[PDB]
Amino acid sequence: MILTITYTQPPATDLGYLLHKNPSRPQTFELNHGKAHIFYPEATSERCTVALLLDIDPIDLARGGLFDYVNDRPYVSSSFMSVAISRVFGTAMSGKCKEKPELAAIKLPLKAKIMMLPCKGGEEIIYRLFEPLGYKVDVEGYMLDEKFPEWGKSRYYTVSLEGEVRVRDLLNHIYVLIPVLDSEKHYWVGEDEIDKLFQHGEGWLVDHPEKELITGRY
Amino acid sequence: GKKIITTRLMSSITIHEENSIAALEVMSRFAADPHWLIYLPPTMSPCETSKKEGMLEHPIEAFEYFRTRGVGKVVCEQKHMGSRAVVIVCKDSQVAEKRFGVLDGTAGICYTRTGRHFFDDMQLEAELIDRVRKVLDKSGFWGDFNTDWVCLDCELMPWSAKAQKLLEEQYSAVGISGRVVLDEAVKLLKQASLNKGKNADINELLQRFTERSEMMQKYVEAYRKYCWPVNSIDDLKLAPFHILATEGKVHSDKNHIWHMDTIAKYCTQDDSLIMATNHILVDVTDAESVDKGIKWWEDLTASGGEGMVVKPYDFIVKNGRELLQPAVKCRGREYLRIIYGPEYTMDENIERLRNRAVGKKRSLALREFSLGMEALERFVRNEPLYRVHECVFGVLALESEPVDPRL
Numbered sequence: 024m025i026l027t028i029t030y031t032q033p034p035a036t037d038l039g040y041l042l043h044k045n046p047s048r049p050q051t052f053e054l055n056h057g058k059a060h061i062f063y064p065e066a067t068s069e070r071c072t073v074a075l076l077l078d079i080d081p082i083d084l085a086r087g088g089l090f091d092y093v094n095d096r097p098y099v100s101s102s103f104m105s106v107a108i109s110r111v112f113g114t115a116m117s118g119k120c121k122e123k124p125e126l127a128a129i130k131l132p133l134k135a136k137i138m139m140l141p142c143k144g145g146e147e148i149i150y151r152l153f154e155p156l157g158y159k160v161d162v163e164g165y166m167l168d169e170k171f172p173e174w175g176k177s178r179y180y181t182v183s184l185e186g187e188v189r190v191r192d193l194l195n196h197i198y199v200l201i202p203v204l205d206s207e208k209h210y211w212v213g214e215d216e217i218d219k220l221f222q223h224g225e226g227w228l229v230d231h232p233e234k235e236l237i238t239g240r241y
Numbered sequence: 242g243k244k245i246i247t248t249r250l251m252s253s254i255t256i257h258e259e260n261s262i263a264a265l266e267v268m269s270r271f272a273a274d275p276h277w278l279i280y281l282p283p284t285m286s287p288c289e290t291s292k293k294e295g296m297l298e299h300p301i302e303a304f305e306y307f308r309t310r311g312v313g314k315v316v317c318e319q320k321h322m323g324s325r326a327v328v329i330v331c332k333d334s335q336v337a338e339k340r341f342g343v344l345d346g347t348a349g350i351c352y353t354r355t356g357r358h359f360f361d362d363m364q365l366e367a368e369l370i371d372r373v374r375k376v377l378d379k380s381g382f383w384g385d386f387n388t389d390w391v392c393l394d395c396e397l398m399p400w401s402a403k404a405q406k407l408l409e410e411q412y413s414a415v416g417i418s419g420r421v422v423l424d425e426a427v428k429l430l431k432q433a434s435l436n437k438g439k440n441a442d443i444n445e446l447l448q449r450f451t452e453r454s455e456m457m458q459k460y461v462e463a464y465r466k467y468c469w470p471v472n473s474i475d476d477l478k479l480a481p482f483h484i485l486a487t488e489g490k491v492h493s494d495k496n497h498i499w500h501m502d503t504i505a506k507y508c509t510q511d512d513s514l515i516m517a518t519n520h521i522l523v524d525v526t527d528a529e530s531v532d533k534g535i536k537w538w539e540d541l542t543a544s545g546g547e548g549m550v551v552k553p554y555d556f557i558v559k560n561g562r563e564l565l566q567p568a569v570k571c572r573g574r575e576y577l578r579i580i581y582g583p584e585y586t587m588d589e590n591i592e593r594l595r596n597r598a599v600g601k602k603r604s605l606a607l608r609e610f611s612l613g614m615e616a617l618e619r620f621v622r623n624e625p626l627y628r629v630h631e632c633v634f635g636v637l638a639l640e641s642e643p644v645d646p647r648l
């Protein structure tokens with residue numbers, strides 16, 4: 024439900040120009056079946072962190088079986104997170120930054136956190152997808168209910184990425200790779216938008232060692 | 242082809258082709274011996290939505306359903322949160338063979354609303370049946386009812402005993418994902434708040450997500466209340482609410498106070514496995530009595546009860562020639578987060594949920610109720626199996642008709 028991006032090269036507030044969002048001005052964007060919020064929990068010379076928050080309406084979602092009404096969709100980083108990234112960070116994804124063109128053209132020290140990514144294939148799939156792009160990848164998992172350990176573990180993983188990468192590459196990688204894990208995407212949107220967010224791979228994807236796996240899941 | 246069934250309460254009930262085939266599937270692949278299947282319980286309707294602030298269901302509307310249709314008194318019973326279980330007990334295996342035609346040597350059965358054995362393990366079933374046999378033995382039930390068999394309508398707790406796959410794959414999945422991201426959301430906004438498309442206000446966002454978080458927490462507490470580990474038969478609880486049938490008699494002519502009283506006396510003494518049902522009588526014409534009903538429902542649900550089943554004083558009731566609901570469900574505010582969603586109580590959500598249509602659900606219940614009554618009367622008057630079976634099969638078929646699952 025949450026994506027954060029953290030930058031620590033002084034002046035770290037440069038993250039604001041690169042993402043085309045003023046750290047002092049929180050914003051809300053409209054999505055299909057809800058909203059996305061962007062704001063900066065921290066913004067100093069030493070450390071800047073941006074947050075992208077999904078605000079999914081459970082009623083409008085269902086109107087678009089019992090588990091059509093009660094489900095994990097409002098709380099996970101599904102393809103909705105990709106759709107939101109494109110809606111909020113579209114210019115940064117393209118590589119444009121007229122205020123800091125030099126920073127946008129080079130590798131920057133960056134950290135990203137993606138919460139509650141549902142993944143049927145486990146940790147293994149996540150490493151196979153992100154490691155070959157050069158990230159240092161941290162994964163943590165969760166039990167379904169700590170009062171009922173017998174129910175076993177969830178299929179949710181919170182993923183940490185760290186590396187030296189261009190802003191546009193970090194955004195593109197997450198934009199394209201998140202839906203690879205979303206086994207129920209063709210259910211919640213179907214065809215129109217799914218095609219839109221596969222066209223974006225037109226480069227590194229053809230060279231990704233998991234091209235088959237990625238093209239398959241689509 | 243199409244199937245027309247005739248019942249005493251409704252002379253024409255149609256079973257369509259689609260429904261008959263969907264029923265045939267589950268009936269032939271997983272169901273118990275059809276010689277035991279003398280009844281299937283009906284689906285149940287909820288009330289009109291409430292107006293009262295931040296409430297979806299409330300006692301007043303269920304009370305009004307009956308009062309405006311000429312029924313002066315209702316019995317409110319705690320809605321146990323488990324799985325419906327039909328419990329048939331014979332005195333011995335010779336009674337089952339003679340009366341029922343059952344050949345596998347069993348002397349009883351506990352089955353579900355779809356007609357499957359409740360327990361995967363027969364020994365556990367036989368064990369449960371035997372505990373019920375002994376209580377009936379000591380209360381003098383067989384003699385007082387001149388019968389060597391009985392068919393009880395019950396709830397079997399805990400819910401988690403049958404719903405574990407649902408809890409694992411759906412309910413606890415929403416709960417862990419929900420609690421984790423919502424807490425992290427609150428924490429980030431709080432940090433943003435302290436360090437302070439369209440413009441948003443950080444403090445409003447923080448307030449909103451703080452509320453989403455508190456609701457998610459209460460949703461998790463709500464589902465947990467109906468779960469606990471089962472390591473033996475002693476972790477279970479059986480709560481019978483209808484005595485349906487004994488030799489020569491379908492007890493649909495007895496009022497619900499009678500059912501509650503007779504069950505408490507013959508079934509629940511000196512065996513904590515078999516519990517009585519908390520209930521009250523309400524005069525729906527009287528303001529004071531209605532106030533008690535409300536208070537009693539508020540206390541029950543505040544202490545974690547699902548809600549109540551509101552029943553007409555008499556078992557079967559009519560407004561002129563019009564058959565009325567034999568039961569209306571009225572569920573707690575907190576319980577309903579498991580049905581309508583953890584966040585259904587938030588203003589922008591709960592208002593969109595007030596416009597629900599129970600017409601279809603009400604019609605399915607009457608038809609299923611009428612088939613079940615007919616199955617029981619055909620069996621009690623000794624008609625051949627296929628005449629009993631077609632009504633029971635009919636209930637199964639109607640249950641495959643699509644309808645809002647939150648009702």
Ligand SMILES: [Mg+2]
Nearest residue numbers: 321322323324
């Ligand atoms: Mg129930």
